[PDB]
């Protein structure tokens, strides 16, 4: 069996020198060779198949390339170790490909791989039209209508002892709006009592408004953004807002797909060509970049295992050109049916899921599951300023009418 050392899949560690022999729960993988053991995710898949299928093995790390490659005539790496009769299987982080499928045959995929997108965590807006929200237009409009009836009643109910309608509107509107303005009060007890009844509604109305306004920006979650690879905002940024910066690791499977489909993608993305996966995250975390694009099965794991949980992907079923992993074979090895039957058994059962809660997991949750309430800023409440701006313009309209009435 040929294998490659990868961070979440196959971890190779020195054998315990204190006990001489290597630690348990590991396989004695040589190299091509001091005695040495390794562990990880794909290792556990291999050892489970050994118990089920009933076959032995002798792992050895490949020392030629990475997951196999074509050098225009010779196949090297993990795949080449199987294409050249050297290795019977190539369990590891092997992406199923059309080109690899015609030189070696694969098994049923046990891990899904695609082409995903990263982005920094979104803080979350506050629905900039929130001030009119904790109510209904039926309640909003009719409450204005209700006061017009009460004001008309109050003038009539006070006439039967200089109030007039103008001061009644001013007085009644004052109470409903956290009374602080100058007011003129009536003298009759029938009108004075009625105002108190409207005053009681003013307390309830104000209390209800501020109570529900709190609830609006408490049960609101935080996603605020979803983007796709095929979207034009990603496809070409030169005909839109300041360009979105995104790059990948060239010379790999993700570059082959991004080259064949969109040639302009390959031309544009070389501006930000990060040669290290970890380094690209730092640039993304520093605001230099805006989206890192790579395989889902290797980028979801790094998104899950991350302090602060500041990196969230949008590869929730939007992975493009999705080909799973698998166990390579010899294209005639007659192990394909037993391997596929056993591998489907774990997938049919809930076996692979437990190994996913293992190394291919992290404390950070890509799902939101978190709500944040920040400062209201200016954008999140600029709507309430627009209502005032209407009044200043509307007052000027009345000013002209107040001026032209005398002349006509």
- 21 known ligand binder: no
Question: How far from the centroid of its chain's Cα atoms is residue 167's Cα?
Answer: 55
Question: Smallest distance, Å, CB 68 to another protein?
Answer: 16
182 touches another protein by CB under 8 A: yes
Q: How far is the CB of 298 from ligand 2JL (least distance, A)?
A: 5
- How many residues are there in the chain? 408
Helix axes 41-49, 336-348, angle to 10 degrees: 110
Q: Rule CB under 8 A: is residue 335 a binding residue for another protein? A: no
Q: Pick one of another protein, ligand 2JL, none as the site partner of residue 295 (Cβ within 5 to 8 A by kind).
A: ligand 2JL
Closer to ligand 2JL by CB, 227 or 257: give it. 257
For residue 144, how many C-alpha atoms fall within 13 Å in the half-sphere facing its CB? 5
Give the bridge partners for 3, in sequence order: 61
Question: Can you state the percent helix, strand and coil of the chain, rounding each to 5?
Answer: 45, 5, 50
Compute the half-sphere exposure of residue 368: CA atoms within 13 Å on the CB side of its CA: 14
Structure tokens at 320: 């493009």
Note whether 299 and 314 are within 8 A (CB): no
**Interface residue with another protein, options 165, 193, 223, 270 (CB under 8 A):** 193
Is residue 254 marked as binding? yes
Q: What is the DSSP letter of 299?
A: H
Whether the CB-CB separation of 65 and 301 falls below 8 Å is answered with no
- Can you tell me whether residue 148 is helix, strand or coil? helix
Binding to another protein (CB under 8 A): which residues in 248-287? 256-257, 260-261
164 is a site residue for another protein (CB under 8 A)? no
User: What does 10 interact with, of another protein, ligand 2JL, none (CB < 5 to 8 A by kind)?
Assistant: none
Selection from ligand 2JL, another protein, none that 67 binds (CB < 5 to 8 A by kind) is: ligand 2JL
Structure-block tokens of residue 195: 């105002």
Site string for another protein, 383-402 (x = CB under 8 A): -xx-xx-xxx-xxx-xx--x
Residues that bind ligand 2JL (CB under 6 A): 6-8, 66-67, 93-95, 252-254, 277, 295, 298, 302
Residues 79, 104 contacting (CB under 8 angstroms): yes
User: Please, what is the end-to-end C-alpha distance for the chain in angstroms?
Assistant: 101
138 binds, among ligand 2JL, another protein, none (CB under 5 to 8 A by kind): another protein
**Which tokens sit at 186?**
């009536």
Q: Does the annotation flag 208 for ligand binding?
A: no
Q: Is 95 annotated as a binding residue?
A: yes
- With CB under 8 A as the contact rule, the residue among 14, 25, 32, 279 that binds another protein is 25
Q: Which stretch binds another protein (CB under 8 A): 74-82, 190-198, 244-252, 280-288?
A: 190-198
In the annotated binding site for L-glutamate, the residues are: 93, 95, 100, 253-254, 295
In the annotated binding site, the residues are: 93, 95, 100, 253-254, 295
């Amino acid at each position: 069996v040929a294998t490659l050392e990868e961070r979440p899949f196959v971890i190779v560690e020195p054998a315990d020198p204190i006990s001489g022999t290597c630690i348990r729960d590991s396989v004695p993988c040589r190299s091509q060779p001091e005695k040495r053991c390794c562990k990880g995710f794909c290792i556990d898949i291999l050892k489970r198949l050994a118990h089920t299928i009933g076959f032995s093995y002798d792992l050895y790390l490949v020392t030629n390339g990475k997951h196999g490659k074509k050098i225009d005539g010779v196949w090297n790496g993990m795949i080449g170790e199987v294409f050249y009769q050297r290795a019977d299987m190539a369990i590891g982080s092997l992406t199923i490909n059309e080109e690899r499928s015609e030189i070696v045959d694969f098994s049923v995929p046990f891990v899904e791989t695609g082409i995903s997108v990263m982005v920094a965590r979104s803080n979350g807006t506050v629905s900039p039209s929130a001030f009119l929200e904790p109510y209904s237009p039926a309640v909003w409009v009719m409450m204005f209508v209700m006061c017009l009836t009460v004001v008309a009643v109050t003038v009539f109910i006070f006439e039967y002892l200089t109030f007039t309608i103008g001061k009644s509107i001013w007085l009644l509107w004052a109470l409903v709006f956290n009374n602080s303005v100058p007011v003129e009060n009536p003298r009759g007890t029938t009108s004075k009592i009625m105002v108190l009844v409207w005053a009681f509604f003013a307390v309830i109305f104000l209390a209800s408004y501020t109570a529900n306004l709190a609830a609006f920006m408490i049960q609101e979650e935080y996603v605020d953004t979803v983007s796709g690879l095929s979207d034009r905002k990603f496809q070409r940024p030169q005909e839109q807002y300041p360009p979105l910066k995104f790059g990948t690791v060239p010379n790999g499977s993700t570059e082959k797909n991004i080259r064949s489909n969109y040639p302009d993608m390959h031309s544009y993305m070389v501006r930000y060509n990060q040669p290290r996966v970890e380094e690209a995250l730092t640039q993304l975390k520093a605001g230099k970049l805006d989206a890192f694009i790579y395989d889902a099965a290797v980028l979801n794991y790094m998104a899950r295992k991350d302090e602060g949980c500041k990196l969230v992907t949008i590869g929730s079923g939007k992975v493009f050109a999705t080909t799973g992993y698998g166990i390579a074979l010899h294209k005639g090895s007659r192990w394909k049916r037993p391997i596929d039957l056993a591998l489907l058994q774990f997938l049919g059962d809930d076996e692979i899921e437990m190994l996913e809660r293992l190394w291919l997991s992290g404390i950070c949750h890509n799902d939101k599951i978190e709500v944040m309430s920040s400062k209201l800023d200016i954008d999140n409440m600029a709507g309430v300023f627009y209502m005032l701006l209407v009044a200043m313009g509307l007052s000027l309209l009345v000013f002209a009418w107040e001026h032209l009435v005398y002349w006509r």
